[PDB]
Symmetry: C4
Subunit: 467 residues, 4 copies
């Protein structure tokens, strides 16, 4: 039935005068765009404050408890020691700084009760089970774990006997690690200006003096786990914070709107399929009656719904970890803004470029299929050869990202210079390898990617012009 | 009337022999180019000296008054302290260095009178209004502000009692900030070689010990506000500086020339419109009789006039802030040099490229319209996800600039490496995100931008060749 | 004979139904891909541990024995001294740190016997043969070498007389170098968790205090040579490591499979040549009956075989140097993964891109022939001129890599800024040189490389479409 | 006369069989290439050693005489001081280190006689002519210069009175600079292994304590001027160095060969012009009978001749400055290697690319003419606006190089991030400016440069194919 199929394939701008139907579903989609974007913005702006407070407190803790800390971490660990005396100095510094906390800290910070309800410091050792050294070792396979609890009144003793205790004989040739752990209370007092009750915090802090490698270096890790707990005893005049109602009602509105959009899009797909079957049955156009933009909308609505549920759960349980909810909401927003291109396609000057991209994607991917085998071979060869001599080739994922950046011309000279001429064979191989890869990929593969795009544009343009 | 319309559409090189009219307006435009460029050059060369003197004095002040200053700022603040004793040491160092200024400074520098006409040092505290700590805080919402004035004869007292005063109990758990402020006189003695009277300066200096965050770190800000004031009592033999007459007369000349150019361009536009109406009335060419280069000239003349007025005002009032005047004059100069292309268009070999750019701009912008939605979605998603884990994604504008640089291949490997694998989910998402964005934008969008430019060139060239 | 030639030129997917022959050789090639890749992965993963242990021990040694070592090397040497007293302090620090090793080290480390079977420290001097200074030098051409052996019981003497010995008069104006050498035993105790017997190590350590240049700086080199030796006396309960059988049997399997693949590929080439001669003799197609992918397979199989033999030799002799074997195996793997493209060529959509690359390569190389002469001239000129004033132009290979990176837009602004304006002539020449090179190569040569690729794509595509 | 003109226009490969003439001039050109390249290589390799020795001695001097020198210069000066006491400490450190030189230096170094034939240290002061401070200055325009000579026996006095002398009252508010100057003898003893007599050196060293700016910072400059002088009294057994004969005879050979090549090329040009006039007179081809490669050869020969003369002069007068000779020889070598393309043009597959480049250059330059005006406007605007707030825009040449690097995508994100948001107006303007410039130049101008190159290639290829 032509009188209906043409109306279906039309645009909303024309339907308003072919049948004078108002485009309320387009208004629903615009409202969804606005509400999703504003929800994401509010969520990010609220997360920034909590993340900043936790990270700043962690930096202050590193400066307070780590001896000689320079303010920047050494890779995944804060600092390291190489001498038998440096380790003792760092451990005793951490303990002594814990003892004097009230006199040194600039924050609104204090001691917290541990799991045993004691206020104090726990330090643990892990040594091999038996222990002459280096020549006739008796070291057994399994480990012995020893811990001691030091309370504030123990550290206070005029002569801190604990420092002379038998516990601190570290026999570093058997040592696996030493762990220092304690709890601290905190308050995010900066929030007081809102007249809301300020958020308290509890920090679970651990210092790990790690020499699993037994290579003569101890790596020092500082970790802090922060929980909100409860502002249970404070006399700060003002008001409490029950804005959850407001935030929970906006999330409910977002969920409802996304649900409505999903229902309407699925209904549109069902109607299009009924039209397709009617066309198939009517008489002996293309099979693709399904509008592909509807699928993207359905995916985005599902992700937005589940991310909003996750956000409501996190707020209700007063959690402070946002990774999965952030991923869901951000991907939903990304797909929501991509879907705006559907409304630009209703105009001729914009449609040809969209059709050019649609024609471009498959052949570019089929050429990526060929390029990927050369890429894999080069990744394996660079990892196996240059890895022991180059920081950018240490492991396979770093190799892949280095090569991907190198195809785009990034950091090329540093990549060339970063490998020493200590081994002449490896240096010559590195020169051959880098020259071949960079030349082939930049000057041939990327040039064929430009040629394919240009040919797709020419094809689409000549189709649109000639008809 | 063809005998006039053709003459109007012609070029000045041909009018000199079709009607032997001399091209005095082109000479006026060339003179305007020369005078605007030389005014901008003189202005910048004069600004460099004042800016350099102020900034060098600020660096010397930071070295003089900030304890342990390394010579480079920590982001927007000069330095920071994390310990209760470091803050006291920094504050007392600032005060003591102020006391000893005459014995430490290498410059031609001295004490200045404050608003109260006293010579001395003012330091202020800002604490919460009530103050047990951390467990039962009585902290009220509003702040109490306390200040003390320390004169030179007070700091001189053999035993500097001020250091033992009750004022310096900082109760850091209530502390918002401590501010130290003072005035210094200075002389730009380097100018003496000109036999002009040297420019004196007054520096208003403030040191802010800031812990609004209450995160256990105090940020230390140093700020200096410099005013010229007057060289009211000096015996340096030589001559005074009244070159203002010279500078004010050149600015008047520039204003007059730009006014004449604006009047002539508006007259040309009026005459072109009269020609257009005469053509419309004559008989049953294109509607665009208005030369678009005239609009750019009018805009540039308006900006030059207002910027010259601003410059004259700044010099007359002896100010030292140049932002708005610099913007106006620089944009005027930029548009003036762009307008030289109009004179290259009078030659065939150059005209085709100008026409190619004119044909290129609209379709490139209409493709930018489609690309911008993908760009916005990626910006929001990267901000929400990678922001807590990546310095380049902390806030939305940084995200946008990072993505824009990334499309152009800049700093790609560092962008890949800058995000820790502490959270595996976020790391995998970052890899997917970066690969998708870089691949799509570099290998498809930029390739369609090259294809559009090439097609525009082919169209213009075949039009010019075939006729 | 057409009935056979067509079958020969066919694809394996079609032969399974034209003659129902199973493609067992393709299965052999897939098995070879899998086994080669897994062998390379296991080899790299095993090498990482040994390399990491050796390098970490070297870093710990540098921190232990080098005075004031900052944790990062100064180019090819660890550190340097410029003062007559700094050198003495560094030498005596190295000796004293050797004396106290058991009390300072964090690792499972101990003293090793030297070649003379003594446990101790050897230090050697190299001075000119004769020695007034600077005005009337009597310095002869040849050198005098003097060494002393210091045992542990000598260093222990309450008053370390050795420090006052006549040996340590270094007369630095005649000094070539001072060398300190010693042996250390070590254990890779981290491996104990496998219940395998841990790998012991012997480190041969040398410290070179080098002033061959006589330019007033002594360069300090630290080198460590590690050998496995034998875990001959240890009481660590567990099991020994005879997994060699497993690793040796997988290498034997890889060798056998590569040998079979090589034999089959050579047989296929022989059969193709017989077909070619039969075609030549039959009647008065192209001469290239040889499938070029077979040659790559043969090369890869030869490299894999020899690399596996090298790996087996290294493991049997318990060596720890992997450069040549890594090169052979990695290049073999790279060529193996490149050869997968042969299987993509059996599909039309992929074949056209392969043919485009094949058509592109020769003309791109013939244009590289012209570009290389300009490249060589610029390399020589930049080396001769900018070398004394620019770190990126010091020597010819650095010049070539800098120019290659510069063509790809890398580090351009730093390259411009890195040359001082101390000599105005050289600065102007550097500006002219850099602008000319960058402009010519980026905006003309790379543009002709894009044009050649596009023309090759157009030719291949129109051939495939039109037939 | 066709029988001669065709032979003239031919190639040497064909002349060997059309007339069997041997191509001895091509052999002369090949010999010239070889000899010029080897002369340049020997020259650079010999210069490297002298430059390295001088620079290493300068670094050792900076470490010896500059207090607290970190091993890296602060821009154009080695180090700086901001305090009245730091300057005194640095000056007295320099003098005391000079006094103790024999006990601290690691090199073959000693004291040199000054112009007055004394061995000692000269230090000079420059103050304003009159000198209350800051309030009523009596400072006159002109300067007073005061110097004192300190000999070794003066510095030796048990109590170094000189340190208490009235000379060292620096009245820093009048101070322009303090200069310390001395001479040192040196020997390049590393050359002794050649059995040649070693090269002695004399270093003229000056330390400038500079505060011309009077901004509260003193900049400390160290400069060293090295001359060879004569190895007039040394007992080092071996042989002298008279290899000059060898080097002077190779330079004479190069001069002779370049002269012969120049004469032959000019003769060829004269013969071509006679052919052109004969063609013009014969009958009523193109006017360009002159082979353009001959002009390049003549220029290269002239530059090689004059550079060889300069090199011979420098060696004869025993100078150590090579800038102008290096420029001449390097440019000669660059043009010599570019001229090899003439021999590639004798082959069809290479000729089309050369013709493509020749056709490309003019239209690319005519588009550069249009692009340069936009470039100039942006340079002026960025200098005037962003200069006070951005290190990359401080002065016009830095602006131009920054923009040129920015067009090529280098350092884009750092350029965006390097400007503070202290002034919001300037920050917004910087964003607008950077986005507009980068977008316009990368996505439009560079795309038209690619289109012009492709169109030139298509034109040349279709001309060569169709005929
Ligand atoms: C969105 O995706 C694309 C859109 C358009 C064009 C290409 C792509 N791709 C890009 C690369 N990308 C892979 C990402 C993971 C690393 C390996 C890449 N594969 S690669 O062919 O070897 C390759 C490598 C460097 C440059 C170009 C191609 C695949 C997607
Ligand atoms: C002068 O302007 C242009 C002249 C010619 C071509 C393009 C542009 N444009 C460039 C980008 N520019 C926007 C600037 C602000 C950030 C977002 C940009 N938009 S974008 O399409 O997403 C995009 C992003 C990366 C690369 C290419 C396009 C718009 C102008
Ligand atoms: C695999 O190889 C290539 C595949 C496809 C296209 C080009 C190449 N080549 C690239 C360069 N490469 C040489 C490597 C050693 C330095 C000199 C290079 N030669 S260059 O022409 O002067 C040149 C220089 C810069 C940019 C482009 C061309 C040769 C191979
Ligand atoms: C050898 O030269 C060229 C060979 C082929 C193509 C272009 C050039 N040119 C490049 C630029 N170059 C000028 C160098 C000095 C700075 C200004 C440049 N001019 S620019 O048009 O504004 C411009 C700016 C950026 C990118 C492209 C063009 C001129 C030569």
């Amino acid at each position: 039935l032509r009188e209906d199929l043409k109306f279906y394939f039309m645009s909303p701008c024309e339907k308003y005068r072919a049948r004078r139907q108002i485009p309320w579903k387009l208004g629903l989609q615009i409202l969804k765009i606005v509400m999703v974007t504003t929800q994401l913005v509010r969520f990010g702006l609220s997360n920034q404050l909590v993340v900043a407070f936790k990270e700043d407190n962690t930096v202050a803790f590193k400066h307070l408890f780590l001896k000689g800390y320079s303010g920047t971490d050494e890779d995944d660990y804060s600092c390291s020691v190489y001498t038998q005396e440096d380790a003792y100095e760092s451990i005793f510094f951490a303990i002594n700084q814990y003892h004097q906390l009230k006199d040194i800290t600039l924050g609104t910070l204090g001691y917290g009760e541990n799991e045993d309800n004691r206020i104090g410091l726990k330090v643990c050792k892990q040594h091999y089970k038996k222990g002459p050294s280096n020549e006739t070792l008796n070291i057994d396979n399994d480990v012995e774990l020893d811990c001691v609890q030091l309370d504030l009144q123990d550290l206070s003793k005029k002569p801190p006997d604990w420092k002379n205790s038998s516990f601190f004989r570290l026999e570093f040739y058997r040592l696996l690690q030493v762990e220092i752990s304690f709890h601290l209370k905190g308050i995010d007092l900066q929030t007081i200006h809102s007249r809301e009750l300020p958020d308290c915090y509890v920090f679970q802090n651990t210092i790990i003096f790690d020499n699993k490698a037994h290579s003569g270096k101890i790596k020092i890790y500082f970790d802090s786990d922060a929980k909100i707990e409860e502002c249970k005893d404070l006399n700060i005049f003002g008001s409490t914070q029950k804005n959850a109602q407001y935030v929970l009602v906006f999330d409910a509105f977002v969920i409802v709107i996304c649900l409505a959009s999903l229902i309407l899009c699925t209904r549109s797909i069902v109607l299009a399929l009924r039209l397709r079957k009617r066309f198939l049955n009517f008489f002996l156009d293309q099979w693709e009656f399904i509008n592909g933009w509807y699928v993207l909308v359905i995916i985005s609505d599902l992700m937005t719904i589940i991310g909003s549920i996750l956000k409501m759960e996190i707020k209700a349980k007063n959690l402070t970890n946002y990774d999965l909810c952030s991923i869901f909401l951000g991907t939903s927003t990304l797909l929501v803004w991509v879907g705006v291109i559907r409304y630009l396609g209703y105009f001729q000057a914009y449609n040809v470029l969209i059709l050019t991209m649609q024609a471009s994607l498959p052949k570019v991917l089929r050429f990526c299929a060929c390029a990927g085998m050369i890429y894999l071979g080069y990744t394996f060869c660079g990892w196996i050869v240059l890895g022991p001599y180059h920081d950018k080739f240490e492991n396979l994922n770093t190799v892949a990202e280095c090569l991907f950046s190198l195809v785009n011309g990034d950091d090329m000279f540093a990549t060339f210079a970063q490998i020493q001429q200590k081994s002449i064979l490896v240096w010559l191989f590195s020169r051959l390898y880098l020259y071949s890869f960079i030349s082939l990929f930049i000057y041939m593969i990327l040039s064929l990617f430009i040629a394919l795009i240009t040919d797709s544009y020419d094809t689409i343009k000549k189709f649109q012009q000639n008809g």
